[PDB]
Symmetry: C4
Subunit: 210 residues, 4 copies
């Protein structure tokens, strides 16, 4: 839990996120909870030019390290941390499938049992607001109250977890769910879904096993 | 046929499965028939952290090696082995295209002659049941009676063969067939198919040649 | 133009074909014109296990090297060579997009000016016949009379050129055209096309430049 | 700003463009503003065979280096430079998604806030004209007057920026926007969009921040 070791992980996540195809238009940003604020990726630096020294610390008051510019989307990383105390890492991206569903402003219903990984029977879509604004931050905080991931209308996705590895994994899983929903929707509307009781059993089962 | 050599192959299949794009949401599991039970991948370990020592042995009674947790989906790997005696390896995954067709709960009809590789004129879809349950196991055993691969409703795919290489190959082929069917279905419903007689000739021909 | 040097190229094409995503379900086969027949890939050997010694020679009478099994689809490689004297290499595959269009049994019309690379204002689709048969061979020979590539109904694609590099390039280009057509067709039917006169000018222009 | 250093960058862009999946059918061409004309990729040489010596200089009169053949599409690279004085690099390709939208001859409306990166509330589609002609050049110059990227009907995409890195980045971003639009269009027509005022705020915000 040394800063430089947290800085590397953040960087490895950016690289890996790219490897998985979630980092298109190189618009993602990643952060972790640290001290009284967070460590986040900087604005204006393509992932492959990133070194541990580029990682920016932002305290709990919204004040950042001198001489360093944090991601232009840092504000909702702070909203996520304040909304979900258990969240230790946040991954945001503009993955294509998640984004297309968010353009239709639809939530992703229970078309697959893995939807329980985000905490319930759906992946919500928070209403649109200009990036970097406090109003966008509010919509995000409200959607994450009972879910670990949310689509953001005409924008992309935010997923949070207890560490970077799980957060990355969740984000990747929502992208798959997103592609599954668009694919079936083009054939039939609405898409068949699993019932609320059936999702209740899977949730209980995930609580049991891990 | 030494355990450690079987353990490596299992691992190479996981890696290769990932390379082919079948391992999204890192949800797959692979096993081989061994002694009176099987060797299978463990639960809770991302494929790249896998070493031969992580591979778990489960006997014919459903009892596993002490201190090791087998895949959460092991039960249907055992059902596959007991349903198809000739099966020596099983590959399961949540490949996107196969899954979307399974969400529509449709079987894949004869839109291409390679559909004969699974044993007939279709790839069935077994009804949904909670993962890890005996009821899911039953539906699987019944679908594999006359086919080597089956879709699992709102879940994914199970393919079995005489060795890991062929099982992996079959799984990959069903994914292609799955993508071909979704693509055409979005344009026309129903999708033109080859007749039962025509599939009868290809099957005979595959019996002849190999 | 030594056999072993032709054998390597064939192998590099298989690898590269795979790299481009045309070799799914590992069903492709590649050949070149050699002496009085051709050199072709063997049946039953996954591309990465291929060595120059696995390449099989088939004379003009349809008789192959002793102890070696040529691709199960060799017959139409011979039909292509006898139909188009100028053809020196043939590439066949079951690329997904080309195959989906072939399942709809539609020819690809002039939706893009690069369609002129195959010789006219379309990529035809030859009617279906069991693989490896003389009747399939006839349909292929007839479609290649005025085009360098053709879709094969419920099967895949055959593209021929003056060398392996161009043949591979053409095959790749038809796959792109195929994906472009399916994508637009799902939105609008029929898809807008360029006129015959406009394709006449591009053809003349390609004759001029190269 | 030495020619050989500009030549390498051009080459790295071709490689990277390919890596991103924009270079299908190997039809792209890239140039930079240099002296009184430009440096551009040559015609007839697959990207991996490219060396700095293959890069061709074309002066402001349309006259090129002796013994070297520039891209067959150089003319609109010159039109782009003369239309947008601030443009220092041009990237052209036949990316699949951009091309499909261009086949429908539709402009890409404001379905995502990143559309502001091209300069306004849309990505236009310039009418079709035979490649390499002065009439095609006119349509391009006119579309780039108020935008940095444009689709070209039944053809592909042209994106310009202040350096190769940003031009490549823009091209990649339009491809993502293109895929987002086709995906949603197959489900609903028309696709919901952000208002002109909302795009006005994002533009102002990008002016502010960078
Ligand atoms: Co964002
Ligand atoms: Co499963
Ligand atoms: Co074939
Ligand atoms: Co062009």
């Amino acid at each position: 839990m040394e800063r430089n070791k947290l800085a590397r992980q953040i960087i490895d996540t950016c690289l890996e996120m790219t490897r998985l195809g979630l980092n298109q238009g190189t618009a993602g940003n990643v952060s972790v909870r640290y001290q009284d604020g967070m460590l986040i990726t900087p604005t204006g630096i393509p992932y492959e030019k990133l070194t541990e020294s580029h990682i920016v610390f932002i305290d709990g008051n919204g004040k950042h390290e001198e001489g360093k510019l944090p991601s232009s989307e840092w504000r909702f990383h702070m909203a996520a941390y304040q909304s979900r105390p258990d969240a230790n890492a946040v991954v945001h991206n503009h993955a294509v499938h998640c984004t297309a569903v968010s353009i239709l402003n639809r939530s992703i219903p229970a078309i697959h049992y893995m939807i329980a990984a985000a905490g319930g029977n759906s992946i919500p879509c928070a209403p649109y607001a200009t990036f970097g604004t406090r109003e966008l931050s509010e919509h995000v905080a409200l959607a994450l109250k009972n879910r670990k991931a949310t689509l953001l209308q005409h924008h992309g996705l935010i997923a949070c977890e207890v560490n970077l590895e799980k957060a990355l994994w969740l984000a990747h899983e929502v992208e798959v769910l997103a592609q599954l929903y668009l694919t079936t929707l083009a054939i039939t509307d609405p898409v068949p879904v699993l019932s609320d009781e059936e999702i209740a059993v899977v949730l209980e089962k995930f609580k049991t096993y891990g």
